[PDB]
Amino acid sequence: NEFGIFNSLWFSLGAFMRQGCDISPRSLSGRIVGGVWWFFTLIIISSYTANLAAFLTVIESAEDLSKQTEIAYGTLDSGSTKEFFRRSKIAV
Amino acid sequence: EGYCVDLAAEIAKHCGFKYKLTIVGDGKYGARDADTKIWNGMVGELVYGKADIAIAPLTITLVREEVIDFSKPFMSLGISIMIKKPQKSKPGVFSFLDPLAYEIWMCIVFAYIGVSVVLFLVSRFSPYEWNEFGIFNSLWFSLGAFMRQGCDISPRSLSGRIVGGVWWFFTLIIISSYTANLAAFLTIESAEDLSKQTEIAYGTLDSGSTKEFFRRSKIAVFDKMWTYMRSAEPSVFVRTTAEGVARVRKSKGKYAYLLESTMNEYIEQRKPCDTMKVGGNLDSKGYGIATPKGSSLRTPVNLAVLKLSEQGVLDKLKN
Amino acid sequence: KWWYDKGECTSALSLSNVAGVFYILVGGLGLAMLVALIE
Amino acid sequence: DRGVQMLLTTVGAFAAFSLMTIAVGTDYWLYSRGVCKTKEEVMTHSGLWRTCCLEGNFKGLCKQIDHFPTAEYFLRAVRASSIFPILSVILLFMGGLCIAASEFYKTRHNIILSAGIFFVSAGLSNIIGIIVYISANAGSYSYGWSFYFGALSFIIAEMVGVLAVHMFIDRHKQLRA
Ligand SMILES: CCCCCCCC/C=C/CCCCCCCC(=O)OC[C@H](O)CO
Ligand SMILES: CCCCCCCC/C=C\CCCCCCCC(=O)OC[C@H](O)CO
Ligand SMILES: CCCCCCCCCCCCCCCC(=O)O
């Protein structure tokens, strides 16, 4: 068995990148591990491609205003807006 | 107790009448029975003299005003759509097995077993061929081809290569169809929206100004909604707003209720807080205090409504 | 009134959409066995 | 061991044959909604040949499926005449005969290969049969226990097939030894 730790990491990487085999696990136990990794790779990689194909096809609230100052804000120096603010009983 | 109980007390004070609140027997607002021509609901109680006044969310309509007397509007409103807040059912744990149907998955297993066995048979049965494809190695070859995860060994005989070839073709077609469907599997805001569909059930109060609005609407969208609704199943017509609302809630958004904006706004502020008002007001109408046609109380109720309007009694009762 | 006011008028791939590939597969499994037995 | 192989093969033959025969006979392939008997919409057992009725006014009345109500004609024919499910039973029977005749007229060693071929072919026939059934039905529903019996017959038949070929291989190895 050539499946030392380094060759195991290489085998796994290659499988996720859908690339070459070289070594392929040869025991029942190793083949169970290999099979589930293969299944995982297929579902995950297919989902990446499909979703990319969708991604390639198709300050906010008053609380926000109050909570920041980078985006300054004001009213007409004389207006009904300035007056509501001056008299609002709402904390925000 | 409530808006209209508080409104009745103030109405009585300003109209100048003593009063007794009574709940309309049939629990309806008022429509001219399609058939018997008899007015039902609160309108009927006034028309047939069972009640002297209707302090209720009764919409001022011509046919209503022709059979009862109405004060000025104490509330302006319009039919509205109540929807159960979406909350799309979360993806299933095993939702990745969705792009293909259950039977396809079953037969993919059956075909895997078939292909593996036949590769073993054709590869090792002949005594004139004596690693190579035993049963375990053949199952491994087949799995590898389907998961497109490369081949460590490949058939060398003509027989084995036919099996391998058809399995490769099968794999390509089946796998590509999964990727694709997954793509597609991963690719109402008004009365007009409701009208151009039917899937989301939607209806009016079984008997009142709302059902009559649609039976009489000259607006294409509302007539379109009406065409559907009178025929919508289950009967999208409801006895009370709450019934349409509960219809809305219990449907997980599959029922939109055409209750009046006033009712919609109220229910939106009620637990379980699972509903939301969508769409514009479907009409520019108002509620009036109603009395029997030609009743003496009509004039007091018109005057009191204006007093409670200039005071904001009705508006305070709203808030 | 009488013409239009009273008007009365993604999914998983099913086995039916892929049955052909199954037929080819099983047919091919058949031929392989024939070739082998003839040899 | 060699004496165990034949036992497993023989008992599996009987098992696969019985399961497939029960399935072809019984009526519990697809529990769906329909008519129990009529010249209105209740659950029905609905097997390969006859549809019956679970729950209903004539709960128990079973009528014959009106399979026939070019490509559809042909598929509808292949379905109505269950040539593929039936052929599976026939082949599995022939395979059992061959296994049995491995005793009398022994040392032939080609009776055993024939048995393997028949069992593998029975499996392939069953899968074509399943595909035809599912494809036809389609133009809620749940598959009954006879459908799943059919399926188990396929799996057992393939396994008996692998064992048969394995035995043939061993025979010729010992003969070459
Ligand atoms: C040399 C080694 C041998 C290995 C060989 C392995 C076979 C690989 C290919 C299989 C698919 C080929 C069959 C394609 C069937 C075509 C169907 C057809 O003709 O379509 C009908 C009609 O056109 C529509 O209505
Ligand atoms: C010879 C070597 C043997 C190698 C063996 C390793 C290969 C494993 C591959 C895939 C496993 C996928 C498992 C599929 C499980 C899904 C079942 C499931 O969840 O279905 C229930 C469904 O959700 C109800 O609605
Ligand atoms: C060669 C092996 C390929 C991998 C096979 C994947 C196994 C799929 C198992 C069937 C899952 C069925 C999911 C649908 C269930 C349902 O909706 O009832």
Residue numbers in the entry:
A (entry chain B): 569 to 626, 633 to 666
B (entry chain C): 422 to 551, 569 to 625, 633 to 764
C (entry chain D): 765 to 773, 784 to 813
D (entry chain H): 5 to 43, 55 to 84, 93 to 162, 173 to 210
Source paper text:
The Phe231 to alanine mutation, which destabilizes this interface, slowed desensitization recovery of GluA2(F231A), both in the absence and presence of TARPs (γ2 and γ3). NTD and LBD changes contributed additively: the R/G-unedited (Arg743) isoform harbouring a mutated B/D NTD interface (Phe231Ala) recovered the slowest. A desensitized GluA2(F231A) structure unedited at the R/G site (Arg743) exhibited more separation of the LBD dimers and an approximately 10% increase of non-swapped receptors relative to the edited Gly743 isoform, approaching GluA1. This suggests that the re-assembly of desensitized A/D LBDs is attenuated by Arg743 through charge repulsion, resulting in a greater proportion of A/B LBD dimers, and thus non-swapped receptors. Closer analysis of the three sets of desensitized structures reveals a gradual transition of the LBD tier into four-fold symmetry, which is greatest for GluA1 and smallest for the edited GluA2 mutant: GluA1 > GluA2(F231A)-Arg743 > GluA2(F231A)-Gly743. Hence, communication between the NTD tier and electrostatics at the R/G site in the LBD orchestrates AMPAR desensitization recovery.
